[PDB]
A and B are shown apart, each in its own frame.
Chain A
Amino acid sequence: EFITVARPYAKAAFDFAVEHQSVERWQDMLAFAAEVTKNEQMAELLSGALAPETLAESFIAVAGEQLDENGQNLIRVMAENGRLNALPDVLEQFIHLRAVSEATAEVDVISAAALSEQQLAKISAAMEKRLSRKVKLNAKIDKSVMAGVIIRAGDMVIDGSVRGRLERLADVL
């Protein structure tokens, strides 16, 4: 795992994208590179001890949909350091940074069944009061909850599932 190596590159890419008003394009560009990083043949090439320069050129070629500023520079700098396998994380970090500056939170909700869209809108407005961000709910239908909902807002979690209450009662006994 290489969160720690991806942090500098993500921060540099984002801090550059706001100097040139193209965060939205950079995100899709990094997502394209992160997908090319996963291929079975390309992952065999990245493991191979080619010279950083020719390995970078062998990586530029498979992605022409890329700015001069973005691909031909970021990919080369990451190749000189041998960091290209970090791209899937440089993406996620980038997204996160964006969500930070845009004052947004990707709250996740989990339930045994669909919510009434009044429950869910109340959840949105209430989390937006609990936090200080525009929330973006996404639901999951997990049956083991059976009733109630889990609201996860990053490291904070609120558990109202009947299974959670049952197992807590199990440990009050």
Chain B
Amino acid sequence: MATGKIVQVIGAVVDVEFPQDAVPRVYDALEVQNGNERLVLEVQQQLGGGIVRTIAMGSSDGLRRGLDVKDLEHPIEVPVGKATLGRIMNVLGEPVDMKGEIGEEER
């Protein structure tokens, strides 16, 4: 499942290496198990060697180089519509008030 590896970490940006036949597209999301939390990276560039430059949608501390990262094959997607009215949401569309999950039908 996890198919790529971190090869650099410069502050907010992270470089990830993939097989050249599976390199993600230029706005896809990626996932990393940062310690115990789950960190989402958004890829900004395709460098040449199956490497990819991404921006971390979260705190970058604790990241080792060599961690496995998992290729979500779709961009960042957020809940939308009537379901999202009386509520506060994260940048990732996750609910940030202490209420339950959002009841959206569409993202």
Contact = CB atoms under 8 A, between A and B. Distances in A.
The reply to whether A and B meet directly (CB within 8 Å) is yes
Label chain B's interface by main secondary structure.
Answer: loop
A52 interface: yes
Nearest to B48: A49
Nearest to A49: B48
A50 B50 CA distance: 9
Interface of A: 49-52, 54
A101 to B, nearest CB: 38
B66 to A, nearest CB: 15
Interface residues of B, number: 5
Contacts of B50: 51
A51 B49 CA distance: 5
Most chain B beta-carbon contacts within 10 A, residue among A50, A51, A54: A51
Label chain A's interface by main secondary structure.
Answer: loop
Contacts of A49: 48-49
Interface in B48-93: 48-50
A17 to B, nearest CB: 31
Contacts of B48: 49
Nearest to A51: B49
B24 to A, nearest CB: 15
Nearest to B19: A51
B36 interface: no
A50 B19 CA distance: 11
Given A49-B48, A49-B49, 5 more contacts: A50-B20, A50-B49, A51-B20, A51-B49, A54-B20
B48 to A, nearest CB: 4
B70 to A, nearest CB: 20
B23 to A, nearest CB: 11
Interface string B1-17: 00000000000000001
